[PDB]
Design an enzyme around this catalytic site. Structure first.
Site, short mmCIF file in Angstrom:
data_model
loop_
_atom_site.label_atom_id
_atom_site.label_comp_id
_atom_site.label_asym_id
_atom_site.label_seq_id
_atom_site.Cartn_x
_atom_site.Cartn_y
_atom_site.Cartn_z
N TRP A 124 6.29 6.51 0.52
CA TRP A 124 5.33 6.54 -0.57
C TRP A 124 4.71 5.17 -0.81
O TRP A 124 5.33 4.14 -0.53
CB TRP A 124 5.95 7.11 -1.85
N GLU A 169 -1.19 -1.47 -2.53
CA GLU A 169 -1.71 -1.19 -1.20
C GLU A 169 -3.08 -0.54 -1.32
O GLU A 169 -3.99 -0.81 -0.53
CB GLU A 169 -0.77 -0.28 -0.40
N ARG A 195 12.57 -1.57 1.65
CA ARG A 195 13.82 -1.39 2.39
C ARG A 195 15.10 -1.04 1.61
O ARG A 195 16.13 -0.76 2.22
CB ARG A 195 14.09 -2.61 3.27
N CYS A 251 8.85 -5.33 5.11
CA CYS A 251 8.94 -4.16 4.24
C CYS A 251 9.66 -4.44 2.92
O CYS A 251 10.84 -4.78 2.90
CB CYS A 251 9.62 -2.98 4.97
C1 HEM Z 1 10.12 4.49 1.02
C2 HEM Z 1 9.45 3.53 0.35
C3 HEM Z 1 8.67 2.40 1.07
C4 HEM Z 1 7.90 1.48 0.46
C5 HEM Z 1 7.60 1.31 -1.04
C6 HEM Z 1 7.35 0.62 1.46
C7 HEM Z 1 6.52 -0.43 1.19
C8 HEM Z 1 5.90 -1.20 2.13
C9 HEM Z 1 4.75 -2.03 1.88
C10 HEM Z 1 3.99 -2.21 0.55
C11 HEM Z 1 4.46 -2.64 3.03
C12 HEM Z 1 3.26 -3.58 3.22
C13 HEM Z 1 2.33 -2.73 4.08
C14 HEM Z 1 0.95 -3.32 4.18
O1 HEM Z 1 0.71 -4.38 3.57
O2 HEM Z 1 0.09 -2.72 4.86
C15 HEM Z 1 5.39 -2.19 4.05
C16 HEM Z 1 5.43 -2.59 5.37
C17 HEM Z 1 6.23 -2.06 6.36
N1 HEM Z 1 7.21 -1.11 6.15
FE1 HEM Z 1 7.67 -0.16 4.34
N2 HEM Z 1 7.80 1.03 2.70
C18 HEM Z 1 8.63 2.12 2.50
C19 HEM Z 1 9.26 2.82 3.51
C20 HEM Z 1 9.28 2.44 4.84
C21 HEM Z 1 9.73 3.24 5.97
C22 HEM Z 1 10.24 4.69 5.91
C23 HEM Z 1 9.59 2.49 7.07
C24 HEM Z 1 9.94 2.87 8.52
C25 HEM Z 1 10.90 3.77 8.75
C26 HEM Z 1 9.08 1.20 6.68
C27 HEM Z 1 8.83 0.16 7.53
C28 HEM Z 1 7.83 -0.77 7.35
C29 HEM Z 1 7.26 -1.52 8.44
C30 HEM Z 1 7.67 -1.44 9.93
C31 HEM Z 1 6.18 -2.40 7.78
C32 HEM Z 1 5.26 -3.40 8.50
C33 HEM Z 1 3.92 -2.70 8.67
C34 HEM Z 1 2.93 -3.59 9.37
O3 HEM Z 1 3.37 -4.60 9.96
O4 HEM Z 1 1.70 -3.28 9.32
N3 HEM Z 1 8.89 1.20 5.31
N4 HEM Z 1 6.28 -1.32 3.45
N1 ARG Z 2 4.45 2.22 1.95
C1 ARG Z 2 4.05 2.30 3.21
N2 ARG Z 2 4.82 2.91 4.10
N3 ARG Z 2 2.90 1.77 3.60
C2 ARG Z 2 2.40 1.81 4.97
C3 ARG Z 2 1.07 1.11 5.14
C4 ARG Z 2 -0.02 1.69 4.24
C5 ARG Z 2 -1.20 0.73 4.06
N4 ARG Z 2 -0.78 -0.46 3.32
C6 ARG Z 2 -2.38 1.42 3.38
O1 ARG Z 2 -2.80 0.99 2.30
O2 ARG Z 2 -2.93 2.38 3.90
#
Ligand code: HEM
Ligand code: ARG
Ligand code: HEM
Ligand code: H4B
Ligand code: H4B
Ligand code: ARG
Ligand code: ZN
Lengths: 407, 411
Positions: free
Chosen positions: B280, B285, B111, B108
């Site tokens: 968001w 993405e 974070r 993520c």
């Molecule tokens: C608030 C602004 C946030 C942004 C900008 C963000 C951004 C991202 C992005 C761009 C990815 C790559 C996802 C992909 O390639 O499909 C990701 C993965 C991930 N994020 Fe975040 N995220 C946010 C919030 C959160 C929250 C609230 C959680 C959980 C409470 C979280 C947990 C995770 C997890 C567990 C992944 C791995 C998903 C997977 O393995 O498919 N993130 N995040």
């Molecule tokens: N910022 C996030 N929480 N992304 C969660 C996964 C969303 C995914 N990458 C999509 O394009 O549909």
């Protein structure tokens, strides 16, 4: 133990048996992955030699042959007698080609078989080295029709008589640190430039000065030599639609020739082994031109395009980047200097990788390096899983000579 | 044992002590690195260590490590596991646990926000209908009229593994995928199989290129049930370009709320098999992966055509040129509708700041370089040049098999 790798865009799956033959360590453990970390005796030598020889002989289909055993026996005695040994010409070639074949960070490896190998093991002096190198540059450049080559200088012995090339590439631009704190030319080479100067080089101080070669033979102090300018093919950078581009004043050299690496074959260490091929566009357009710590030309290119540089979300950096790379591939193609774009390059490596799994049961790859520094996910390698392990013969890193040299 | 990571653009070096507290395995060994491999019913005796460890962390985090409160809770949970062969988390603990699973999500880039997370306790939920209501509330709280808020809803933990709560959608809101007879795909190919399950389960499919899928919810191990999300709850952004008036004609829109629902949240040994979380989007993405992946909406050719780019030779970088415009048009559309969104530059810049702070105050920050680096313009973002150590900390978000692969149909 088998291992599978999936391509998430084609669902193609491949089974890797080759990692089983792995020897070296990865820097990784069960509890930690360092996949993105850039740099993670008689009795020692014979196993290394035996292993190599086995590979070689298997490769020529004489595994277990008398020839094989004899050579095994010969090398054996020689190590016992001389505490080292020498490779037959055939073996040196096999070894070099295969170190390339095993270079997990190389996207170019579909070409691994067509490699020109120059045996400069009879070399004894820096002047000798200079001559060999000039021949390599000329053969490889080939009037812009680039050819892949490597020149192999004498192997290490007691470690006190190393042959070393002090440049990191045969041809690179100099870096001068100005008093105001800025940098002229290529910041990557600022320190090497200071060593050259300090050693007598009369520096022109320009943004694109071809550096002098600095060559060390037999453990001796390094000596300077200028590469015949007539031998140094260069490409002026212009854009197919932006006439203001040429005014930026950009050029690059046509021949990437990594020189600072260490080639290991059958336990033998070749501390000076310049190799050369042709550029992938991005190496120049993306990394050399736009890295913040290299030529860093994004702002200027942007300005001339009059892009919205107030807010990052205009993607002005991204827009400029694309043009810059379009201009690089364009300039080279127009001067008929070999070059490959990141799409073709990565597409080929997928083909290569597949073939390697078929005929060799695997192909070590470092995803972090294989995926281009721009447009990652639109190239096929992004979606391609890769297993990374270390096979010999290999190309290894080694410390900068000035850090270790006994003057 | 200390470990160092260098930033090759700033020469900043950081020392990682945190990997020492690592527990889980990486898939990697001394002889092989699987850093680019996408995916590399408990017991009383298994559970208490897991619980004790978590509780220690928690209590240390509130500065009551070793306190009477700490020991008592330790004692309480202890007895409860012995008695009930499981246990329940105090509200405070559940929140700490959730926030920290996010904080440990090595993939993520978002974070830096890990501390500001709205946690909804839906552990009192018992039915699919209950789930539907909870989820609707989450969607509405989180969307917030386009001013997106991060939230997670936590449904009852697993017990015997026969009464799992599961959300069958992979995100709360996603577009359907229909495989046409000619072999092509309508809508989003990523969801074709899920779409077939919905249909098969009674969904009256509109068959369009952007149909919001029905929720398919499973409570207590029961068969899944369908519910349509109130359309009024589903914020969407029509995609247009700030300079290409022909763009809107492409017919593109996306939803404003990414809400991953198929993951498994583990806290103090407890397994929460249904835990939708939302935040968001980062532009890429959508613009890069969802729009341009060959196996998603795959719009590069068309966008290229309309731009009349040289598509004869790949070295024109027509794909690259189109890609940039497409992503410009996504960030533009969203910003113009005041729907929260972040571009890959800002996002990655913040994560460097976050990562640094994490090394200062926490002695490390697990990161998966392969995922952290944006799918476009990699090396012009700061994370490209940033070395990252990847290890697994709990609480964590884990993957789990698709429910249809494992569900015991009751009929
Ligand atoms: C608030 C602004 C946030 C942004 C900008 C963000 C951004 C991202 C992005 C761009 C990815 C790559 C996802 C992909 O390639 O499909 C990701 C993965 C991930 N994020 Fe975040 N995220 C946010 C919030 C959160 C929250 C609230 C959680 C959980 C409470 C979280 C947990 C995770 C997890 C567990 C992944 C791995 C998903 C997977 O393995 O498919 N993130 N995040
Ligand atoms: N910022 C996030 N929480 N992304 C969660 C996964 C969303 C995914 N990458 C999509 O394009 O549909
Ligand atoms: C023939 C066309 C070739 C192409 C298109 C190509 C392409 C590339 C590229 C893009 C990189 C990344 C380099 C960087 O980012 O600094 C690379 C690395 C590398 N290549 Fe190739 N290469 C070719 C031939 C060769 C040859 C002939 C050899 C050796 C015989 C070789 C061995 C290596 C090694 C060892 C690295 C990693 C070097 C390092 O870590 O700095 N390649 N190659
Ligand atoms: C931190 C990371 O290891 C470092 O930036 C690497 C990333 N990936 C790379 N990939 C290639 N082909 N060349 C490079 O110099 C790098 N640098
Ligand atoms: C095979 C490879 O690991 C796979 O394509 C991964 C690579 N890096 C990624 N990085 C992010 N943030 N999201 C992804 O879906 C992927 N896909
Ligand atoms: N294609 C090659 N052989 N490249 C070797 C390394 C070149 C280096 N990355 C540069 O851009 O200067
Ligand atoms: Zn690894």
């Amino acid at each position: 133990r088998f291992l599978k790798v999936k391509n998430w865009e084609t669902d193609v799956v491949l089974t890797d048996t080759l990692h089983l033959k792995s020897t070296l360590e990865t820097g990784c453990t069960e509890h930690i992955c360092m996949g993105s970390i850039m740099l993670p005796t008689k009795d020692q030598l014979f196993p290394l030699a035996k292993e190599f020889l086995d590979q070689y002989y298997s490769s020529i289909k004489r595994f277990g042959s008398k020839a094989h055993m004899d050579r095994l026996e010969e090398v054996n005695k020689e190590i016992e007698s001389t505490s080292t040994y020498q490779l037959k010409d055939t073996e040196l070639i096999y070894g070099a080609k295969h170190a390339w074949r095993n270079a997990s960070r190389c996207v170019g490896r579909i070409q691994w078989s067509k490699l020109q190998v120059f045996d400069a093991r009879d070399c004894t002096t820096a002047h000798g080295m200079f001559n060999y190198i000039c021949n390599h540059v000329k053969y490889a450049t080939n009037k812009g029709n680039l050819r892949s080559a490597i020149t192999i200088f004498p192997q290490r012995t007691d470690g006190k008589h190393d042959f070393r090339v002090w440049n990191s590439q045969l041809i690179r631009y100099a870096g001068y640190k100005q008093p105001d704190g800025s940098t002229l030319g290529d910041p990557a080479n600022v320190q090497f430039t200071e060593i050259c100067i300090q050693q007598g080089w009369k520096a022109p101080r320009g943004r694109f000065d071809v550096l002098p070669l600095l060559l060390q033979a037999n453990g001796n102090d390094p000596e300077l030599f200028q590469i015949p300018p007539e031998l140094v093919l260069e490409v002026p950078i212009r854009h197919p639609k932006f006439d203001w581009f040429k005014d930026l004043g950009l050029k690059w050299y046509g021949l990437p020739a990594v020189s600072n690496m260490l080639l290991e074959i059958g336990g033998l260490e070749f501390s000076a082994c310049p190799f050369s091929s042709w550029y992938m566009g991005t190496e120049i357009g993306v990394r050399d031109y736009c890295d913040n710590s290299r030529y860093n030309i994004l702002e200027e290119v942007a300005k001339k395009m009059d892009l919205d540089m107030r807010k990052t979300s205009s993607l002005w950096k991204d827009q400029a980047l694309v043009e810059i790379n379009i201009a690089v591939l364009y300039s080279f193609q127009s001067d008929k200097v070999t070059i490959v774009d990141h799409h073709s390059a990565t597409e080929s490596f997928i083909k290569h990788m597949e073939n390697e799994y078929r005929c060799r049961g695997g192909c070590p790859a470092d995803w972090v390096w294989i995926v281009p520094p721009m447009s990652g996910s639109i190239t096929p390698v992004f979606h391609q899983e890769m297993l990374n392990y270390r096979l010999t013969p290999s190309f290894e890193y080694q410390p900068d000579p000035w850090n270790t040299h006994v003057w």
